[PDB]
RNA sequence: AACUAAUCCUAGCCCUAGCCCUACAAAUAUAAUUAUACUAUUAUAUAAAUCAAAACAUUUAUAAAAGUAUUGGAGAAAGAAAUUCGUAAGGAGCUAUAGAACUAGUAAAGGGAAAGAUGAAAGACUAAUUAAAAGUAAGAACAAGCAAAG
RNA sequence: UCUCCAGGCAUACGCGUAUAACAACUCGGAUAACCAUUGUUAGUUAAUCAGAAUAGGCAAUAAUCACACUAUAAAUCACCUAUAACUUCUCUGUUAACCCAACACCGGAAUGCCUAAAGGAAAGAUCCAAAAAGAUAAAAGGAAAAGAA
RNA sequence: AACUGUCUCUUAUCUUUAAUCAGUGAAAUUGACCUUUCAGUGAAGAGGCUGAAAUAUAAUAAUAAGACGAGAAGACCCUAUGGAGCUUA
């Protein structure tokens, strides 16, 4: 869950449970060359890789072997008509390697007469 | 310079409207009203100059007295500085 | 634009509105009333008439009070109306002499006074004038109680007055502990200043303290709407039974 | 292009509607048991600029009195803010005066147009 | 920003009202929600215009400009499909009509009768003709998406009609989080220690 | 009928009147905007001078009586009273070099801009209007000369 | 492929998408080509690289291959005794020909490695003017070699 | 002192510049000018006045020796029964 307050933990405190998840993730075709078992995901910047591991394992029942995550800086060079810099939203790219020997491949989404010119053909005259 | 390339629309004005028609009425209130109410009493406008006239310095000084307590702090300081210039110009030149 | 009320009336409006209105009437009267402190360093004109310059005729007179500075240390002490006079002096008391920047200092002291009501001796900053007033007051406790705030010129003294007034008001056994017979004599001796407990609490309280105190008095924990609906439901059901 | 983009909007509307319904049930029970209109403790506090703003209380492992940093945080207005308060009142009056000027110019064209 | 026939925010609207445009604003007489009586699908008679006196059904209403658009009326001619290979085909293009340029039509008698707004027994506001008083019912307009609700057939991920209408909530003193625990049997015995909120 | 250009009317302002007032999440004073401990925590002096006294030094304002008496390097100036008296939206303003600096406080204290123009409809192919500034072109020049005059 | 040139590569600091592909050829490069410009899309993957308990008791002798050897310029928490806690891998940085000098500046810019295996092109074309600037060469002479006062 | 193209005494080649083609494109400046020579006049003084003389139009390419060149409040020194400021015991 993002943009929400999480309880502070003290010794002996309750285990943290998120009953409803506000994290929304997008599976993206690998821009770079990656192993087939590896899967790329665009995820909220506040999500941890453990959260993704728990997220995939619990919500989607997907076995995960390894996870690698990177933060892509959003370009701020672009400027509007007022010369005010426009910042691309920063997104986090997560490389997830499947377990159990599973492999992944991105699906193929989106698989007048010439002799008489100047007189309109309408004229019979 | 250059001038407009289009003519403005014609305008018609009524000279017998109530305001123009009744302009000046009751101006003889004092003479015809037994002088109970002076025509100066009929003046409506800024408080400090109702029935009163004076030079710019006098008008400014009277304005300060009438609404000095009800004026803004920034305006009061500006008025004080403006009064200084007016006082020197009239009273020393 | 122009404010309908002058700036000085803004303070009056604030006092007349909000929690200020909700303040106790007795305390509000004490704050609203102003009593002039007893003159010490200047005397008002003995005669009410003098010669007007422009007309050269006898005219009514006005009084110019001398500026006297009372430092906050006086509010932490018990000064008998004495104060620091800050200004300019003409040397040798002749206008023809030089003007010298002068700060006039009344002789200040720290002394101990015994309070029968509080059964304790308090060491406090005091002036010789206060000591004479205490003797004239027939006791230190009398001076604190008898003297008004302005003449007393002491926040601590007013605070002492607050404690003394409350002690008298409640007939608290704290006075002269282990001596109930002696306690009654002190209360009888200072019976004149016995007042309602509510008034005594607010005597000498500062404006910021009074506002916070009133806020603390009126602050109340949020009502659980379950309880509110229970009371409302019972009332309607009880009315229905009728 | 994304096929049937309205699908995403419909789901978000469904998801948003779910949250308010769940929040409504939580809000109703919270009010009954405690009477609090806000899930998180809070109060109105004065900042150093003299404004009155709702301050949401934060849970700490230590108390405020032993939390020197919390005491270091300023919830009090300085004496000089009185001038700013007068300016704020004057600024509000100026805005209303400018608003009337804005209306007057609009009125002129109404006469010109009609 | 001058409102035009082009929908606000469209490419035509952006060209119509570019960021730097400061044209002399066009003043439109404000009309209250109660005052306004023209709605899409309403049969109205054009008081003045190209097709003045021809009754038509409203299809678009730009209330900001007090404009009512009648399909196939107030029509000028433009070319569709203009290209290099072909000159193009002439088509009908409608122009906006101001509110004063149209009037509502009494159903029984086809005339431009002035109307006054009045409530009914159900409480729904209905226009009543000032003369020959009669109720002009609100016209029926098809859904913008073109979907007739009943005719619609559930596609993938679409709950059946009965499922949506079913009510399963039982009033109880438990939140969703608490109720979820009971159904799935989540139990937590650990307790947070005292926290000083401030 | 020529290129460069030019054209326009509202963006709004200004002064009085009236009116006082009492109306997302997340993060933050730590290093503000850093999701939880550290380290206790905090504004404000006569208003002055400039200035006037042609310098400069005491000094220099900021309803009638009356700018009078008094006060003052008696000079620049300052200046009472007594005693009478006191009921209660508009513009012979501005219209893009004007009017608020403003379309805008936008593009270290602090400083602080530039500009826009069709029509009823652009779900009518975006409007016209002008021998109209200087600058140029159409159309370089022809012994002799403040360039014009007779 | 040929002719020729010879400070190259990492990190720090700074910059913040200037990175790359595609599409454009108007503006930006102090002119073009070509892009560093314009638009679109992609990118930088970390348990290992980098950044983000307490109370007492008690410590003489530099280094220099530390030995000898001397010296003066004077240069070295630990560990014990108790108390307390009791099973952990997330978060963040990672691109680039990049930064400070108004600039694709000529200089400014910390450290390690290494000196070509790394890194590069002086020639917009034509002509072979004079004059001017730099460099090389001198028949005979030698201020009209580097020594003295 | 020698040494050498520094010079007696200059020459030659290479590079830069130079010249031509194409692309791009400033700055100080600017009353208007149909912008001559000689003698005179004048304030040291004339393309423009007086009197002589010369003169198709338009373009194009070269050089800085002298007029002890034109000049400024540049440079330099000294003065005051001149001012004003400063230090005081």
From Swiss-Prot, chain B:
GO BP annotation list: mitochondrial translation; translation
Compartments in which it is found: Mitochondrion
Family: Belongs to the mitochondrion-specific ribosomal protein mL51 family.
Originating gene: Mrpl51
Keyword terms: Mitochondrion, Ribonucleoprotein, Ribosomal protein, Transit peptide
GO cellular component: mitochondrial inner membrane; mitochondrial large ribosomal subunit; mitochondrial ribosome; mitochondrion
SUBUNIT field: Component of the mitochondrial ribosome large subunit (39S) which comprises a 16S rRNA and about 50 distinct proteins. Interacts with OXA1L.
Superkingdom of origin organism: Eukaryota
GO MF annotations, alphabetized: structural constituent of ribosome
Source organism phylogeny: Eukaryota, Metazoa, Chordata, Craniata, Vertebrata
Entry protein name: Large ribosomal subunit protein mL51
Organism whose genome encodes this protein: Mus musculus (Mouse)
Curated annotation (Swiss-Prot), chain C:
Main location: mitochondrion
Keywords noted in UniProt: Mitochondrion, Ribonucleoprotein, Ribosomal protein, Transit peptide
Recorded GO MF terms: structural constituent of ribosome
Subcellular location: Mitochondrion
Gene3D superfamilies for the chain: Ribosomal protein L28/L24 (2.30.170.40)
CC per GO annotation: cytosol; mitochondrial inner membrane; mitochondrial large ribosomal subunit; mitochondrial ribosome; mitochondrion
Keyword Transit peptide attributed: yes
Residue range of the transit peptide in the UniProt record, numbered on this chain: 1-54
Any one Pfam family match given in the protein's UniProt record, by short name: Ribosomal_L28
GO BP of this protein: mitochondrial translation
Domain of life: Eukaryota
Self-association and partners: Component of the mitochondrial ribosome large subunit (39S) which comprises a 16S rRNA and about 50 distinct proteins. Interacts with OXA1L.
Family of the protein in this entry: Belongs to the bacterial ribosomal protein bL28 family.
PANTHER family recorded: 39S RIBOSOMAL PROTEIN L28, MITOCHONDRIAL (PTHR13528), LARGE RIBOSOMAL SUBUNIT PROTEIN BL28M (PTHR13528:SF2)
Protein name, UniProt field: Large ribosomal subunit protein bL28m
Source organism of this protein record: Mus musculus (Mouse)
Name of the coding gene: Mrpl28
UniProtKB/Swiss-Prot annotation, chain D:
Protein name: Large ribosomal subunit protein uL29m
Residue ranges of coiled coil: none
Sites of N6-acetyllysine modification: 20
Shown residues within the full chain: 127 to 240 of 252
Subcellular location: Mitochondrion
Oligomer status and interactors: Component of the mitochondrial ribosome large subunit (39S) which comprises a 16S rRNA and about 50 distinct proteins.
Organism: Mus musculus (Mouse)
Family affiliation: Belongs to the universal ribosomal protein uL29 family.
Biased composition (Basic residues): 104-114
Domain of life, source organism: Eukaryota
Gene behind the chain: Mrpl47
Curated annotation (Swiss-Prot), chain E:
Keyword Zinc assigned: no
Phosphoserine carried by residues: 6
UniProt keywords, alphabetically: Mitochondrion, Phosphoprotein, Ribonucleoprotein, Ribosomal protein, Transit peptide
GO biological process: mitochondrial translation
Annotated CDD domains: KOW_RPL26 (cd06089)
Subcellular location: Mitochondrion
Single GO molecular function: structural constituent of ribosome
Entry-linked InterPro entries: KOW, Rib_uL2_dom2, Ribosomal_uL24, Ribosomal_uL24_CS, Ribosomal_uL24_KOW, Translation_prot_SH3-like_sf
GO cellular component: mitochondrial inner membrane; mitochondrial large ribosomal subunit; mitochondrion
Domain (KOW): residue spans on this chain: 38-71
Superkingdom of the organism of origin: Eukaryota
Major location (coarse): mitochondrion
SMART domains in alphabetical order: KOW
PANTHER family in the record: MITOCHONDRIAL RIBOSOMAL PROTEIN L24 (PTHR12903)
Family label: Belongs to the universal ribosomal protein uL24 family.
Record HAMAP family: Ribosomal_uL24_B
Quaternary context: Component of the mitochondrial ribosome large subunit (39S) which comprises a 16S rRNA and about 50 distinct proteins.
Protein name: Large ribosomal subunit protein uL24m
Protein's organism: Mus musculus (Mouse)
């Amino acid at each position: 869950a993002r943009n929400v307050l999480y309880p502070l933990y003290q010794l002996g405190g309750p285990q943290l449970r998120v009953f409803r998840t506000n994290f929304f993730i997008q599976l993206v075709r690998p821009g770079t060359a990656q192993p087939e078992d590896t899967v790329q995901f665009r995820i909220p910047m506040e999500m941890t890789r453990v959260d993704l591991r728990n997220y995939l394992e619990q919500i989607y029942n997907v076995p995960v072997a390894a996870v690698r995550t990177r933060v892509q800086h959003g370009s701020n060079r672009r400027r509007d008509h007022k010369n005010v810099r426009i910042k691309k939203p920063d997104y986090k790219v997560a490389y997830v390697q499947l377990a159990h020997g599973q492999t992944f491949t991105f699906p193929d989404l989106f698989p007048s007469d010439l002799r008489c010119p100047g007189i309109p053909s309408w004229f019979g005259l | 310079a250059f001038v407009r390339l289009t003519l403005p629309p014609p305008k018609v004005v009524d000279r017998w409207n109530e305001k123009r028609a009744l302009f000046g009425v009751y101006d003889n209130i004092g003479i015809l009203g037994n002088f109970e109410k002076h025509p100066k009493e009929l003046i409506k406008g800024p408080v400090w100059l109702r029935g009163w006239r004076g030079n710019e310095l006098q008008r400014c000084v009277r304005k300060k007295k009438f609404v000095g307590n009800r004026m803004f702090i920034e305006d009061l300081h500006n008025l004080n500085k403006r009064i200084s210039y007016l006082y020197k110009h009239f009273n020393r030149h | 634009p122009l404010h309908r009320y002058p700036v000085h009336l803004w303070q009056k409006l604030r006092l007349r509105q909000g929690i200020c209105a909700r303040l106790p009437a007795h305390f509000l009267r004490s704050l609203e009333e102003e009593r002039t402190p007893t003159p010490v360093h200047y005397k008002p004109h003995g005669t009410k008439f003098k010669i007007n310059p422009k007309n050269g005729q006898r005219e009514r007179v006005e009084d110019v009070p001398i500026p006297v500075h009372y430092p906050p240390e006086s509010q932490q002490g018990l000064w008998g109306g004495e104060g620091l006079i800050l200004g300019y002096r003409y040397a040798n008391n002749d206008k023809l002499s030089k003007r010298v920047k002068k700060v006039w200092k009344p002789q200040l002291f720290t002394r101990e006074l015994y309070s029968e009501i509080l059964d304790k001796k308090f060491t406090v900053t005091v002036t010789m004038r206060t000591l004479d007033l205490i003797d004239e007051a027939y006791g230190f406790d009398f001076y604190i109680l008898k003297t008004p705030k302005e003449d007393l010129g002491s926040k601590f003294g007013m605070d002492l007055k607050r404690g003394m007034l409350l002690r008298l008001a409640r007939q608290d056994p704290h006075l002269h502990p282990e001596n109930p017979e002696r306690r009654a004599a002190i209360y009888d001796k200072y019976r004149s200043f016995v007042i309602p407990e509510a008034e005594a609490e607010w005597v000498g309280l500062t404006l910021e303290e009074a506002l916070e105190k009133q806020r603390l008095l009126e602050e109340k924990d949020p009502v659980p709407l379950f309880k509110v609906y229970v009371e409302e439901l019972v009332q309607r059901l009880q009315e229905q039974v009728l | 292009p994304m096929p049937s983009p309205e699908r995403l909007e419909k789901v978000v509307d469904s998801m948003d509607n779910v949250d308010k319904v769940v929040q409504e049930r939580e809000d109703a029970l919270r009010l009954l048991q405690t009477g609090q209109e806000k899930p998180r403790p809070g109060a109105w506090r004065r900042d150093i600029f003299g404004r009155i703003v709702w301050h949401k209380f934060k849970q700490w492992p230590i108390p405020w009195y032993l939390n020197k940093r919390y005491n270091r945080r300023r919830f009090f207005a300085m004496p000089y803010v009185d001038r700013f308060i007068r300016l704020r009142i004057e600024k509000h009056a100026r805005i209303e005066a400018r608003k009337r000027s804005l209306q007057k110019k609009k009125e002129k064209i109404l006469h010109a147009k009609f | 920003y001058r409102y035009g026939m082009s929908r606000p925010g469209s490419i035509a609207d952006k060209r119509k009202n570019p960021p730097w445009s400061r044209r002399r604003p066009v003043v439109v007489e404000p009309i209250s929600d109660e005052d306004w009586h023209l709605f899409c699908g309403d049969m109205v008679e054009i008081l003045e215009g190209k097709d003045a006196g021809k009754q038509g059904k409203v299809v678009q209403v730009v209330r900001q400009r007090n404009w009512v658009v009648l399909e196939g009326l107030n029509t000028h001619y433009r070319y569709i499909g203009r290209t290099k290979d072909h000159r193009g085909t002439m088509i009908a293009s409608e122009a906006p009509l101001l509110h004063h340029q149209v009037k509502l039509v009494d159903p029984v008698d086809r005339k431009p009768t002035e109307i006054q707004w009045r409530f009914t027994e159900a409480g729904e506001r209905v226009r009543v003709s000032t003369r020959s008083g009669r109720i002009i019912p609100k016209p029926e307009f098809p859904r913008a998406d073109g979907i007739v609700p009943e005719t619609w057939t559930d596609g993938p991920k679409d709950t059946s009609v009965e499922d949506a209408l079913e009510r399963t909530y039982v009033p109880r003193l438990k939140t969703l989080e608490e109720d979820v625990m009971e159904a799935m049997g989540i139990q937590e015995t650990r307790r947070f220690k005292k926290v000083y909120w401030y």
